[PDB]
Design an enzyme around this catalytic site. Structure first.
Site, short mmCIF file in Angstrom:
data_model
loop_
_atom_site.label_atom_id
_atom_site.label_comp_id
_atom_site.label_asym_id
_atom_site.label_seq_id
_atom_site.Cartn_x
_atom_site.Cartn_y
_atom_site.Cartn_z
N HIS A 69 0.64 -1.26 0.17
CA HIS A 69 -0.14 -0.13 0.05
C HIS A 69 0.74 1.27 -0.01
CE1 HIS A 69 -2.73 3.13 1.72
NE2 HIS A 69 -3.78 2.30 1.08
N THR A 70 1.90 1.19 0.87
CA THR A 70 2.70 2.55 1.09
C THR A 70 2.29 3.63 1.79
OG1 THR A 70 2.77 3.39 -1.35
CG2 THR A 70 4.04 1.59 -0.95
N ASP A 71 0.84 3.83 1.86
CA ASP A 71 0.59 5.08 2.40
C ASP A 71 -0.39 4.64 3.47
OD1 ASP A 71 0.71 8.04 2.73
OD2 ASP A 71 -0.75 8.29 1.20
N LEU A 72 -0.40 3.87 4.28
CA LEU A 72 -1.34 3.54 5.64
C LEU A 72 -0.95 4.76 6.61
CD1 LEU A 72 -0.83 -0.12 5.82
CD2 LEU A 72 -2.65 1.03 4.64
N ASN A 76 -6.44 7.28 6.16
CA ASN A 76 -6.61 6.35 5.11
C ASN A 76 -7.48 5.16 5.70
OD1 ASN A 76 -5.91 7.72 2.98
ND2 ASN A 76 -3.71 7.02 3.14
#
Length: 262
Positions: A69-72, A76
């Site tokens: 995912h990289t953007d938890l 979000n």
């Protein structure tokens, strides 16, 4: 740049994610809005447990299908219904603690080009800062930071800069493994294996006063609290090769406290 749409379509075909109808379903407030709308007073441990369970399930799914995912971050993660039941002692507590993971705009496949720097700063792992390469363990780190934030109400790494961030990490979790320090090209941060840091600087003062060993953030001493912190400390392992996986994290005694509805 709707190669996002692509990821969403690839995801649908294989699921506690907010996915497409064609925009998508509207849900309640996100877990950070709720925090702010409640004075940054933490979620109670049972909520934190159910939310953790759902997060680990959600991302284990991505992680077993060649995706990170990289953007938890708390922003979000969405409550399906953020309807709450206020109670005096005033604190707010959400009615249904079910959640969905959103924003696959940054989700990267194993075979895709990986940008050097990913994640929002506060949720960014050491391998990224030190540019040691990254993959799925990136998300696990973020999840550790997020669980802490749910449990204390405030950010683990309230930082604005790499050096500070790394110093906070050592302050809270112990020294960076020496092999990671030998491997990074970011040698300007170090001297003879030690982080270059002026403790008398304003930030240095902030960290001395406000960052302490992880265990010391425990509110209560019950078994369930001890286990949450055992699980967090495994999620915040410095070395991504040794950091717990989400498949492993679900086989943790901490989740014994779940209801069977949960």
């Amino acid at each position: 740049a709707r190669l996002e749409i692509n990821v969403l379509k690839k995801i649908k075909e294989k699921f506690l994610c907010v996915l497409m109808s064609d925009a998508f379903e509207l849900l309640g407030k996100n877990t950070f809005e709720f925090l702010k709308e409640n004075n940054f007073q933490p979620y109670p441990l049972p909520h934190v447990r159910h939310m953790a369970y759902q997060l680990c399930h959600a991302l284990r799914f991505l992680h077993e299908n060649q995706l990170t995912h990289t953007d938890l971050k708390p922003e979000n993660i969405l409550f399906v219904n953020s309807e709450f039941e206020t109670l005096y002692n005033e604190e707010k507590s959400v009615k249904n603690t079910s959640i969905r993971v959103a924003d696959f705009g940054s989700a990267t496949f194993d075979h895709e080009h990986h940008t050097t720097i990913v994640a929002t700063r506060h949720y960014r792992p050491p391998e990224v800062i030190l540019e040691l390469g990254w993959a799925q363990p990136c998300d696990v780190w973020s999840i550790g930071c997020i669980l802490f934030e749910y449990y204390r109400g405030f950010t683990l790494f309230q930082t604005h800069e790499n050096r500070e961030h790394l110093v906070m990490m050592e302050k809270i979790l112990g020294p960076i493994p020496s092999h990671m320090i030998h491997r990074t090209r970011k040698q300007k941060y170090f001297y003879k294996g030690g982080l270059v840091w002026d403790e008398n600087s304003s930030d240095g003062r902030y960290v001395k006063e406000n960052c302490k060993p992880l265990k010391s953030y425990m509110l209560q001493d019950s078994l369930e609290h001890v286990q949450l912190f055992d699980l967090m400390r495994r999620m915040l392992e410095f070395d991504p090769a040794q950091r717990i996986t989400l498949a492993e994290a679900l086989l943790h005694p901490f989740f014994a406290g779940l209801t069977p509805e949960e």
